[PDB]
Amino acid sequence: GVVAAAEKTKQGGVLYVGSKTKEGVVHGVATVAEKTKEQVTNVGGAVVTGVTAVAQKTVEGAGSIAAATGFVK
Amino acid sequence: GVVAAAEKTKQGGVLYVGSKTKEGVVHGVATVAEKTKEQVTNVGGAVVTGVTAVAQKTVEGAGSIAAATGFVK
Amino acid sequence: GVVAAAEKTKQGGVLYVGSKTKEGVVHGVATVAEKTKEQVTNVGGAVVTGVTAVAQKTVEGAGSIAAATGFVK
Amino acid sequence: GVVAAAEKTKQGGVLYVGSKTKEGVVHGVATVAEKTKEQVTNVGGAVVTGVTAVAQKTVEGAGSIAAATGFVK
Amino acid sequence: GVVAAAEKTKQGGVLYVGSKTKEGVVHGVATVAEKTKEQVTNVGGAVVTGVTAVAQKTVEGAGSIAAATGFVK
Amino acid sequence: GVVAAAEKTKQGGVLYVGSKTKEGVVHGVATVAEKTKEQVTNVGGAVVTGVTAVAQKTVEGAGSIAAATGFVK
Amino acid sequence: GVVAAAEKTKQGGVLYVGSKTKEGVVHGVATVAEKTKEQVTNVGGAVVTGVTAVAQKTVEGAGSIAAATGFVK
Amino acid sequence: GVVAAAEKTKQGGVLYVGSKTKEGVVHGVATVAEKTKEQVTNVGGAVVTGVTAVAQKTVEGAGSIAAATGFVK
Amino acid sequence: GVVAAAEKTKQGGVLYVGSKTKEGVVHGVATVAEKTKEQVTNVGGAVVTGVTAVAQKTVEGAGSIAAATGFVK
Amino acid sequence: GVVAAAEKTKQGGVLYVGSKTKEGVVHGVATVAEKTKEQVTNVGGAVVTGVTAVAQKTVEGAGSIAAATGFVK
């Protein structure tokens, strides 16, 4: 019995980034495995991956994540 | 029994990014495996992947993610 | 029994990005596997992948994602 | 029993991106596998893939995604 | 029993992108496999793939996606 | 003053190769460049390129190669 | 003053190779450059490139290679 | 003044290789550069590149290689 | 003044290799550079590169290699 | 004044290798640099690079290598 819910109702800065680089190698989320049952992901926020990875104001509301497994009985 | 829901009702910055690079290698989400039952993904936010990966104002409401498995009985 | 729903009703910045690069290799979401039952994806947000991957205002409402498996009985 | 629904009713920035590059290789979503039952995708948001991949205002309402499997009985 | 529905009723920015490139290779969604039962896709959002892949205002309502499998009994 | 000469005068094994493959990509000699004066090649031996590239008894005599440049004065 | 010469005069094994592969990528000689005067090659032996690249008895005589540049004066 | 010479005059094993692989990436000789005067190669032996790269009895005589540059005066 | 010479005149084992692998990446000779005058190679022996790279009896005579530069005066 | 010479005149084992591997990364000779005058190589022996890199009986005679630079005057 898996339920997940979010309401956002409404009744009504500066950033300078400069990267001068050479040779980046960037990974985001990785799950790596061998011989597995499940590999879930739920991204109810964000996954931001960049050499210059700016995430402004990123979740401004109402994330809802359920996740389950199990119940072998 | 899997339910997931979101309502957003309504009744009513600066960013400069400069990347001067050479040679990026960027991964986002990766799941890598061998010999698996499931590999789920649910992106109820965002996945943003870039060399210059800007994610502004990214979720402004009402993400709903359920995820399940199981119940072998 | 899989249900997922979202209503958005209504009753009523600056960004400069400059990437001067050479040689990017960018991956977004990848699931890679061997010998698997399922590989699901549900993108109820976004997947944005770019060398210059800007995701502005990206989800402004009402994402609903259910995902399940199981029930072997 | 798979149900998914979304209503958006209504009763009522700047971006500059410049990528000067050479040689990009960009992947979006990829699922890669060997010897599998299913490989689903449901894109109830967006998948945006570009060298310069701008996703503005991307989901402004009412995404609904269900996904299931199972029930071997 | 697969149902999916969306109503949008109604009772009532700037972007500059310049990519000066040379040699892009861009993939969108790809599912690649060997020896599989199903490979579904449902794009109830969008899939946008470009060297310069701009997706403005992309889903402004009422996506509905169901997806299922199963029921071996 | 470029001179090159070879005389072969005359006054008088087993190999099993089996390649069972799938998907080869083979390059031989490549010179790749940008903005160049000369790109010479002289093949006074052999260039053998194959997925299964057998070169038996390949030069049995008398290769002569000169190569020059220069002399700006 | 470039001279190169070879005389072969005459006055008078087992190999089993089995490659069972999948997916090779093989390069031979490569010179890769940017903004160059010369790129010479002289192959007064052999260049053998293969997934299964057997070079038996390859030079049995008399290779002669000169190579020069220079002399700006 | 470049001279190179070789005479071969005449007055008068087992090998089993088995490679059972998957996924090789093989490079031979590579010279890679940026902004160069010369890039010479002289192969007065052999260059053998293979996934299974057997070089038997490879030079049985008389290699001669000269190489020069210089003399700016 | 560059001279190189070799005469081979004539007046008159077991090997088992088995590589059972998965995923090799093999490089041979590489010279890699940036902003260079010369990049010479002279192969008056052999360059053998393979996943299974057998070099039997490889130089059985008479290699001659000269190499020079210089003389700015 | 560069001279190099070799004469081989004539007037008249077991090996078992088994590599059962997974995932090799092998480099041979590499010279890597930035901002250089010369990068020479002379291979008057052999360069053997392999995952299973057997070099039997490799130089059986008469290697001759000269190499110089200099003489700025």
From Swiss-Prot, chains A, B, C, D, E, F, G, H, I, J:
This protein's encoding gene: SNCA
Domain of life, per lineage: Eukaryota
Clinical note on disease: Genetic alterations of SNCA resulting in aberrant polymerization into fibrils, are associated with several neurodegenerative diseases (synucleinopathies). SNCA fibrillar aggregates represent the major non A-beta component of Alzheimer disease amyloid plaque, and a major component of Lewy body inclusions. They are also found within Lewy body (LB)-like intraneuronal inclusions, glial inclusions and axonal spheroids in neurodegeneration with brain iron accumulation type 1. Parkinson disease 1, autosomal dominant: A complex neurodegenerative disorder characterized by bradykinesia, resting tremor, muscular rigidity and postural instability. Additional features are characteristic postural abnormalities, dysautonomia, dystonic cramps, and dementia. The pathology of Parkinson disease involves the loss of dopaminergic neurons in the substantia nigra and the presence of Lewy bodies (intraneuronal accumulations of aggregated proteins), in surviving neurons in various areas of the brain.
Similarity remark: Belongs to the synuclein family.
Result, substituting H27A: Impairs copper-binding
Annotated tissue distribution: Highly expressed in presynaptic terminals in the central nervous system. Expressed principally in brain.
One annotated GO molecular function: microtubule binding
Main location (coarse class): cytoplasm
PTM description: Phosphorylated, predominantly on serine residues. Phosphorylation by CK1 appears to occur on residues distinct from the residue phosphorylated by other kinases.
Keyword tags: Acetylation, Alzheimer disease, Amyloid, Cell projection, Copper, Cytoplasm, Disease variant, Membrane, Metal-binding, Neurodegeneration, Nucleus, Parkinson disease, Parkinsonism, Phosphoprotein, Repeat, Secreted, Synapse, Ubl conjugation
Record remark: domains: The 'non A-beta component of Alzheimer disease amyloid plaque' domain (NAC domain) is involved in fibrils formation. The middle hydrophobic region forms the core of the filaments. The C-terminus may regulate aggregation and determine the diameter of the filaments.
Function per UniProt: Neuronal protein that plays several roles in synaptic activity such as regulation of synaptic vesicle trafficking and subsequent neurotransmitter release. Participates as a monomer in synaptic vesicle exocytosis by enhancing vesicle priming, fusion and dilation of exocytotic fusion pores. Mechanistically, acts by increasing local Ca(2+) release from microdomains which is essential for the enhancement of ATP-induced exocytosis.
Protein name: Alpha-synuclein
Residues engaged in binding Cu cation: H27
Region ranges (4 X 11 AA tandem repeats of [EGS]-K-T-K-[EQ]-[GQ]-V-X(4)): 7-44
GO aspect biological process, one term: microglial cell activation
Assembly information from the UniProt record: Soluble monomer. Homotetramer. A dynamic intracellular population of tetramers and monomers coexists normally and the tetramer plays an essential role in maintaining homeostasis. Interacts with UCHL1. Interacts with phospholipase D and histones. Interacts (via N-terminus) with synphilin-1/SNCAIP; this interaction promotes formation of SNCA inclusions in the cytoplasm. Interacts with CALM1. Interacts with STXBP1; this interaction controls SNCA self-replicating aggregation. Interacts with SNARE components VAMP2 and SNAP25; these interactions allows SNARE complex assembly and integrity.
Sequence repeat windows: 19-33, 34-44
Locations listed in the record: Cytoplasm; Membrane; Nucleus; Synapse
Any single Gene Ontology cellular-component annotation: extracellular space
Positions bearing Phosphoserine: S64
Organism: Homo sapiens
